[model samples]
Target chain A: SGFRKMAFPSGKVEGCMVQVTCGTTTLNGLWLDDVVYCPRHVICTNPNYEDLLIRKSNHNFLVQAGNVQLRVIGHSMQNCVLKLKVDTANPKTPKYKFVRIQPGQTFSVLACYNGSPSGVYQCAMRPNFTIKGSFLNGSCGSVGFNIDYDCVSFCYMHHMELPTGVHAGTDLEGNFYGPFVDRQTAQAAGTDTTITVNVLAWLYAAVINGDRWFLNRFTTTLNDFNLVAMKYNYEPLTQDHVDILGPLSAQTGIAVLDMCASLKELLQNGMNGRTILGSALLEDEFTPFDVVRQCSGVTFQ
Target chain B: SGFRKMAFPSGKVEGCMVQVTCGTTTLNGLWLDDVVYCPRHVICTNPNYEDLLIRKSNHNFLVQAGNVQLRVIGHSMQNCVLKLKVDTANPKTPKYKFVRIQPGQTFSVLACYNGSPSGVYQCAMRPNFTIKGSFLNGSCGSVGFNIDYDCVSFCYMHHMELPTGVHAGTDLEGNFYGPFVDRQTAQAAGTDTTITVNVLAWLYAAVINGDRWFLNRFTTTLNDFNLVAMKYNYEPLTQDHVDILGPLSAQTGIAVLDMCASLKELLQNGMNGRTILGSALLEDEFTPFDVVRQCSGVTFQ
Candidate 1:
């Protein structure tokens, strides 16, 4: 290279055990960028056995690795709404949006990306009216989350990130090794890989995997399948599992890891000829189509 | 010598039994007067019982007798206050000197002898409140008489005449004899005579003779020692009974004769003894005095 680059240290580590904590950004239109972060070990290394519980009082936790602050948003309500702004410097510009989180109403926003993550994020939440007013607060009106991890993570995490390309490598004896090439291919492959990575990351955070060997076993299984041709393991990830994971993780965190595993199996079936597996996946599949038809009827009628 | 007295037969007979008849002028102010006529047999010479039964009403006894007209002085009260002027000479006499009488109220008028028997005849009556008030002509409170009898006798006969009296004479023989006076005296004379005389008009008209006989027998076993005085043989009549006898009689008209037997007996035991004497007379006997005094106390009180 240009000055012999100190022999360019061989095989540099690519990913540390980084955990992605996610949440919605908005809370009834109020800005919340100063949410606390989850402790690194609790969020990343250790299994998620408990939710990041927060109350109206001062209790909180770290949400991300010093990148985005997050907290659990709680109010006496159902059908909660959230709003986010990527740049607090630009108050007028909102970054992300979500509406109608319900009792057990939850979602995740990827606060920071391991690569190519942009935008300063803020979040707010709006509580919705319960059929019965809150027994605890005795208030029928809505309340929003403040600048906690709930707000920050809600803004930062819901928007995702991915690598634009992959690097190639060489075997010991002059074998040709390469990464994804063109923009079209890169986009496709990168997107697919990122989604798989996201799923695996959530699983890793939830499951008790003491054997690093299990990863190699999983890689070998994936290697036997042709992803681009014959359509082996190149399946689209389902919005359903992701939807369930939000509520499930919010309720029990990594304690719901077994349920998530089941959910993943269901989603994998849905990617195959099963069409739609879990109730959330089926709902996601039909939601857009139903909305289109409903809009069309409204227009015609 | 005195012009033969004109032989006018001044013992005038205006009414059929005119001997006892009186007028407002001839007997003016006299409390009693004598009728001075023969007894029933001597007057009628018939001695038939029929002759004793006089129907004075059959004759125009009042008008033909030229009896002094007396203005009925009082009014008959129906309910309460006197209905004044009820006895007006002319119903048209304006401001007449009469007044309507009321029941249970005192009524008074001076008979004034407005020919003969003027007296303060007070009539205390209760019209609707008395049996007399219910009588056909109850308005006329009491009538008095003044002819040939004591006031008591006149009073008695007009209302309750007894059937006997003093018979002091003989049957045309000079056998001067007597069934004289009342039965009590005859009884005291040591006579066994059943003096059949009216004792207070024989108690009852139909049994008048019966009562006379009863009384004569009532005192049959009298002794001269037990004889009472003749002065004790009379008693004052009650105002109620006296009213029937228009005015007092001076001589012999029977009035209140129904009470004679009772009176004589009472008096025999009633009178102060100074008035009589006999072979068996008891002196200083205070019993009669005490009795009479007690009886008199009833009336005066």
Candidate 2:
């Protein structure tokens, strides 16, 4: 039998705006902040942040903690590649590079000497991307296991009546851009442009902790391309309602855009923003849509 | 909706045959009497019949009550494509000729007619085999699905497994024959040649249910070649197992050759000794393996 010493420390990144729950603990005494791991874990102290974003600049972030390898699993994230940096002399400033994570493909990278010898180490990050016309890259290889979410999207509403157009949309940019076949065509038409303007009513409601229920009505339209629009209604969720059902489910939507944007930035620029990881626990407890509902609900038709 | 009466009886030669506590029933008063689909319901009267074998020649024995339409959803049971006929007018005369079912594809045939004219009329049988090849045939486009079950010879196995003549003292004619890719090639090598056979056990199990199950498994294999074998040594499952886990499971090990022989015969000449109109089901309840298992509860390794 062989013996290996494993170090565990709270590997929580304290971001400037949001205090994300540190889902992972540091290996030995290394900080994995500003880097995203496939199985990323973060802990948030303040549960009131609207959205957590990880931005990187110049060099890519390597979030390897110990000898155990890390690879990105199934993700709605687009164009994002895992980057590796080996800087034993300067832990913060390591040789930075990244590679794309192809659809349904897995690649391995090694990062050894976590504790025994504290020195600069070598890391590998290979680029894996789907060919221009390939819909699925399953032939590339297996990526551990591919998982699918049971539900599509969950959202929170601040009002009873959903707004028309922009407010009615889910987090899917496909609906926004109407299934752009080519990225250049979409960019040329400015179809991918989306402005996440601050919602004051949502902020106010969250601050007040108002008692309201939410409703989500959705429909799809396929004119030239497929487009889905959603409407929401907010009301005071009562104990009777809670008792009848389980709990008053807030409209919770996965931040697919953020994930996509994060990945896209990494591919084109090597790295753009800090990889601000969030916690599954936080997502379970306080959702982004809930905060918006608490402050002011969205109105979409 | 149109006021047309749709009376389509599936032209599947095989049906439910496994008997546990409760016996399987037939739909539309169809009975599996030996190889014929008699109008009366044939109960699973015997307990000794552990396995079923549907032969090709007996496919013409189906008797239809009143008026019915027969449609097939698998591969053509015969080799001749143009001379195909569905045995409706006369049981002795072949009614339908068949097209070969390629690997990694699904084939579905729809037979529909009005039941208004309450007279007995032999239905029609249509056969379609999916097309599968590398990039040229538009692979997944020709057929609904595709199936592939390539044969591996013992020579290749021995050559890959051993570096030298390990079985030098053995009977050369009976022990070693092929390094060929498939059985067709082996057949071309003449009957007297010997070959060490790697019995593909998992594929046998998957195709055991009937031709439908076999077709499904073969199609999946063509789609994914890495699934060379299936897993075994599990629990005996009921409908729950079938429903949740699925009918066709890939396991490990070279399965027995007899199953493939039976399947190939079925695909070529239909089941039993009767000429099938389209497809025929197996009737022999016990295979050699099953009989051996029942008698001793164990067999030679």
Candidate 3:
């Protein structure tokens, strides 16, 4: 149903604030925090409420991806081409940088099974993703073990070390844009986007190569974080719950230094009040309804 | 819901022989394909119908883990021992064999992340499991990436390869038994069992080192296989369905020379008409209710 009359009115932004946790989305209404208040769920007139209104900016484009690797999920026998599409905010034109993640070593699984290594390297954050759109780039020969999409996002969350050397700076606009995808140096951030991961292909690869859980850890937490953000955020978890969640949470705080290009882009444009990088929505994109999906559309399945 | 039914009987197994898809399990009645048949749902007095009367046998105890590696999903950075349990049809006693799936190449992931290899090897199907209970290995530091549990089952189905050299034969009384998990060499088989998988830890490992999708493929495939087997098996999927399942099956036919110990044991012990491994129940443990859960318990979580 649509909104109408209001009774118990509070003058704070908490009362009129709109969030993803809001129940209804069928109607398009006011997504504000001021006069035209929304007591409950209402679309954020600006999903980019961060930088536009509140000026939050992370100037570092050279984000750390923890100590994660560029994991390739495919057959160890087939040579692969990691067609990573590195999009950057170039002054003139956005360039597409393609990096072929070389097959570093032959996994033990292959030798243990009388097999050998192939062209696919196990995994990586690539030397340094000097480009944006880097996280969404894992169409390696279209081979299935495409856990790369999830792994990259996962590594970024953890702040794994990035590719050796990549140049990053801001233009004269004093606007912190990026050639790479960067988060803050000490914190992990959540993002929502769409991409496909070939979990089966990856699983099969694990059996063939020898993933000592490198890819496993990153992917699992993404799904878990989404679960908690969706289902359990409203309540206190029990001991057993904590046992799992606590440990996972401990495991999930994988931090990374990232290129807040989008965040900076949002900031440069200015959302009037909300700081792009400092907003709570930037870390969590979930609403009550959004939680209904299986993943954050970033990391896991 | 309970049931008392009389309906059109076409005769034969399809007409009345109760199956997992029959739905209702609350009401217990006849589970026979003879005169008084189940028009729909019924219960089986003997889940062990492979021998006893129906007498089905597979006299092979020497099983296989395919050629896949015995994947240990834990922190490669941690030094740990793999304590695996081995059960058997002991006229004497069952033993436990501990095999360390040595960390092969410090997983490309580790090196890329500026890390080094530890006690954990990437993945594997140990040399030879003379004792049963092999697939349930991989508690290596229990560091989290417990994808080992899922990998074992996945490899079993795919029939990767197996240990370099292992012992496999028959017993004196014309009976067959084994110390490993195996399937037929020419084909792939399905099994249903229970176990937990720590998806997150492994994911993190993927980030740390390299997991060329070996774990990725197996784990992904298992979950997907279970999904299709449970949800869509009853329907007709279009091209998209085949696009996934078809290739998966193509990849999934990972044949292996298995011990068929359970099958042999069941045959020796007898399940009436069901041939332990040869029976439909052996491949699919789903009873409608089973499908209601997540993974088949054997593969992915």
Candidate 4:
């Protein structure tokens, strides 16, 4: 008898949790394949599980998660022309630029990016001058990160997943069910859906988060803020905080005044905002936009 | 026939005035030898005839007239070894000595002497250092004089003549028209005869006179005394003045305290005693003893 038989379970196995494990432990609650699930739970249900589905197709995932755009905002007593080069794989064509930033001014440059989840992209900054003392807050060559599938998944878990198209779905009982699809298909099926990434916005959020991390972790003593501030001549940070964050907030959809006010609160409570900002600027994961939101009381979108 | 005939036309040749004219002006009041004299009337019959006998002889002329022995006594801030030389005709044997005079003390050295009237003795002081600012009151090379017959005569006119010896003379009837002799015979013929010369005393008198001349002639202003005193650091001349004059006083028969008292009075009346002493030390004719008596109220004996 010639009977039509399905070899494997077909149609589309959508919204399936990709199990991720390292040795004995399975990573859990990481946003992978449009689901918040454990790798161990998925692996326990079925052995021989291969790769974890990392969410990297959406505009938010592509721009915010995969790519890192950095802005080295200059807040100095004198005009500083930062002669910098982002080290690339091709030694002949190096990504170098002269950022002529006046006092209380800022400049942005593409630091790094990962086009696909598999390809690893790295970015490191090298300075022509010995950047220390009262001018620069920290050293260059501090930018580093992994852009593998696991890292993308971890990054997605920290952020909200982008909205995609909805489709119909059904159960085995033949009851009417709808609005279910894969994240990639959902995104492709949508008509004229714009995916805009504010590079400065992402940087701002990153800077804010980094500052918040520094405030919470490092600056616990009363004199720590003043010590760092006096070392860098950064007492003007509070005075020019509004000007520094105003444009960045508008571009990044962050509340500039509120973030600054929150920064002031942390500074008053023995936090060095300038050093924290410097740290975030040199961090590979956090952008300047992220720094603003992380520094503020508001939630980063 | 060898007859000793004495032809005389004498009644009484009494008071005589011997007029001595160098060119046109008649000289007056000079003691011309055997005659006790006046200028306009010399009790002689030949009024147009003019000649005077001058007795320049032994003892009176030698001790009081022709010979002048001088001593320069030095009173200095420290023990000043004054190197002095009396320039003589014999270049091989010069009359030079180092007279060491202590501070607040005095030392006497033979300045000059005219044993015979023809020989001219010149005494001068030569300094190793430029003896100014304190040690010397005036310039060096100041102590010089010509000692001859002329100088003795000039000096004699300025001083009182010395008393020697006298013999009785008779006029015709043996009525004892007595008491007449030359200075030499009178000095030699007497029983208790004394031929005394005080060289230092004369010098002291001369120095005091020179100081008086300086005070009267040069220091016209009221501040002159203080100015000179301050220059030499020598307001203590009175204290040392007695010490300088005392030994000289006993030897020269001059009053030491009286002379010092007179010097102090002059100093109070705007006289510079240090300059006076300096002048006396540098004067060839004057001795250190003369300086003391010259400053005294008593006439120099």
Candidate 5:
């Protein structure tokens, strides 16, 4: 054995990120012992981009815009719960008990703040004090929470969000009413900058209707959105855009408020954070948190 | 009528359109007798604008982008099928037996062409030759299907169109794979301008998932979408926007083609037509129809 050990020398490389490839699209997730994970069902890598949005499990489980998910993945023999070491933002947070995760399972906790440090979120993850029931020698997750916060106040975000995680084909034909009208006209015009018109209608007609996905998908600044839309538009645009936006166009300013109240229920529910998905729609992401670091720059209550 | 002549200046607004208002959002529908109808489910007017879209019954039934619906409504004891007179565009059309509209029910016919006069479609309606019914006094709907083609070749469009439609929660979790990936990637990156970012995701997640509605939701062009998205963006868009469009961003160039082939089915199906919803997604609505009155002017096949 000693002679063999001295025979040859070799080099090994290790990557902290796990890579998950879906077709031509490949993104990196948390690479842990052959197990890959991301905070939300939506997984993207610096290497991939997609215009797709999917419904994870239920809208109820989706996250708000500014709020982030501290998703702990579970795989073979791995089981544990995630807890917050402290409530740096609001006491209201941490209201829920510790989050739970198990082998081949996952758990998520909301992380948001309205204090100083616009770019520093320091979203630390704290696991439950110790492991619970498990297979003999089965490893429980660790409690090393404290990671750098979002580069901006936007917080941890994902791809799947309904603003208010809810709704399905309410219509008899399997169609649904997003009650989108109410949220606009009478729904308190927050900031204006937005990209919802073109993408939104198409989305309802195609993208997000599916299930199996997760978070953010809404945690961006309205300013950035405008820039993107602007950049894209600096090129080829036409009446196609105008015609598609139909009613949302300046042509139709005031609509019948009848659907307003009903549709209102579909919005600003507990599932929505003050500026998370909300500011995305209202377009005030850069408005300023009022506090130190606010999500999308809009102030939180 | 004989009795009214003798006494009052009685009147009946024998409306040419239907009238179906959901709650306060009321717009004129086919105002034919007690029969209210529209060419598609999405009904609106100068009176309303809803951030809403819905699947009529199935994506199969949804119309193409620019091609509008000649929705003849249905009601008790009132029904009849409709037909077309000539093929101003390509003879390839008229391949279908004939347009059909019925009493106590309705029917639709596709009319799209690529020709010269950009604004004058002359989308004249020509109902089925004659009647086939009961109720001795029960008159069959007249063969007056000839209505002016869409003001532009954006053929009688409507609020529906999956691009290629036909999708539901394909994923086990009752969620689906819209296969939206391939569409944006290589599907031939037609035009750069677009508005699908904000509205699309939300629509897929909310509005369009609902059932029952129609007409012109996607008939615009990339230019207009950009204009609209641009207009909306000129206001508030902030980081909230950047966060929402994680993938569509220029940040990521290519996505795994895996989801592309699959999601591709969700678009450009028989239910869609050139420039119909196509131009809406691709932009070019203003691109002069190579032919007379080409819908959303990107040319028809």
Candidate 6:
């Protein structure tokens, strides 16, 4: 009786199979299932479980770099219309599009661009009524995203090491990081990856000759990072990034560019590199690898 | 002894003479004098009073169409600077002149103009301080006069006439009365002279047809006049003439022109000509002669 056939209706019922028991003989060896079965549920040692956990209905409105897409998932309503503005820089002449989404259906529209994707795109799902309740109301469900060719793609790849980070560059590790780091970190490190080779060289000389008071102060702060990950995913540094970082640098001391230069000299002189890394250096000179070890606590064999 | 020859000082003494007594012969025939005499008073039996009663010191500031003149009579002070403004219509660029008046002296300044004197000229006497006192303080002494081409000269001549006395013909006694009289006498009549021609015509017809309703009303008011000569001699009607008469006419019923036309008709209709004259007429019809007779009580033979 391990393979008993049972009759089932054709109507769809999505749920997980909790258990099966016959009197005192419990079918403990049977595999619990989560599925939507049609016709019947057959006994088998290995049973395929379709996604039967009914997800609570929700409106998923998304605006990506190159396109805007929206959908209503697990909702009982037939369809919903979404109002979308693809380009928002010029509010007076913003491009608008209306999209209709059926329940469990997705609708996407391509974002037109000049050269590359640019400007902010916003989307809002219009409300739809059902026996249950309404979908979107007011500004409760509005969403926005931006796209910039050079900055966005590059920043999309690398994580912001610090909040003041303005330019993109690799960290001491071979891993990609950013010129887009916090003002304090950029100031303390003194060697911003964002600077050009020539500027970096000039910064080197300035640091060699400059006083050690700032160098010591910056190095002390730089060593404080303990591999804390950002709570949110990385995005391109925007005007908002500069707004926050610019004033912070001004209020702290010299700008990020100057800080980068100072920190480079301090590190090269073996002043604070070991303290920052919390490890011994492979060579007498501080290498980018040492920063990686310090940040990630991963040592290269 | 009443004519005793006494030496007089050069300094002026300005006052009315109190007496002219002789020893026992009470010679009270001479009138008391007001004078600023430098020497003794003499007379012949034909004692011509050659205005030897010199008036006391005073300032008489006059502004005319052609010029502005000021005189200080019986004044003991040596000289004074009068700050005077000539034309005020173009107040933005008013013409100003400074005149110096010596004690017992007369000062005149020619008012330069475009053509026949046009526009009003104003004069003000500036202050002068002597060991004695101040002269012409504040705006106490200021005068203005206008120089128009037509009205100034014509209005200067004729006086305004009665409203009922229009018609250029003749009065009942065949003596000429008038359309009107001089502005001074007309103003004295307390009636405006600027009546419309049509209204004057209507008034004439009314006077010829209608009974003495208006005549009795008008005569009742007209008989109230008693002759009293003005202390100052008459000058031609200036703008000041119209300024006074124009408002009076507005306050009354008719215009000067109408008044002239009506009076001419009334004179032609032989309406109350003798009563207006305050004496019998020289003729049975209206004439300018009757006007003079009515106004001055002087019958023309």
In order, what is each prediction's RMSD in angstroms? 69.5, 29.8, 28.3, 57.7, 30.5, 50.7
Question: Model 2: what TM-score?
Answer: 0.15
DockQ category of candidate 6:
incorrect
DockQ, model 5, C-alpha based: 0.01
**What is the DockQ of the complex in model 1?**
0.00
Go through the candidates in order and give each one's DockQ: 0.00, 0.00, 0.02, 0.00, 0.01, 0.00
Clashes of each: 94, 99, 133, 45, 141, 65
TM-score against native, each model: 0.13, 0.15, 0.18, 0.14, 0.17, 0.13
lDDT of 4 by residue, B1-301 (tens): 0000000100001011122221232222212232111112211222222222122111111011122221212111111111111111211222222122211111111111111110011111111100001001111111111112112111101001113211121111112111322112322222221101122233344433232342222212224433443443333234344455566566445465444334334435533224342232212223343233223211100
Model 6 C-alpha lDDT per residue in residues B189-267, reported as the tens digit of each score: 1222221222222232223222223332232111111110011111122233234334333434444333343343444
User: Residues A193-227, candidate 4, lDDT per residue (tens digit)?
Assistant: 11111222333554433323422222223244335
**Tens digits of per-residue lDDT for model 6 on A141-253?**
11111112111111111112222212122211212222222122432223212212222222222233232243433422222211110111111223332343343345445
**What ranges in model 4 sit over 4 Å off?**
A1-129, A132-235, A238-241, A251-254, A270-301, B1-301
Ranking by lDDT: 4, 1, 5, 6, 2, 3
Candidate 1: Cα lDDT at A236: 36
Comparing 2 and 6 by lDDT, which wins? 6
Candidate 2: segments with Cα more than 4 A from true spot: A1-98, A102-301, B1-196, B205-212, B215-261, B266-301
CAPRI band for model 4: incorrect
Off by over 4 Å in 5: A1-218, A221-301, B1-14, B18-301
Among all windows of ten consecutive residues in candidate 6 chain A, which has the lowest summed lDDT?
A1-10
lDDT of each: 0.21, 0.19, 0.18, 0.22, 0.20, 0.19
Report the Cα lDDT for candidate 1. 0.21
- Sorted into a CAPRI-style docking class, model 2 comes out as incorrect
Candidate 6, residue B176: lDDT: 20
Q: Give the TM-score of candidate 5.
A: 0.17
DockQ, computed on Cα atoms, for candidate 3:
0.02
Best by DockQ: 3
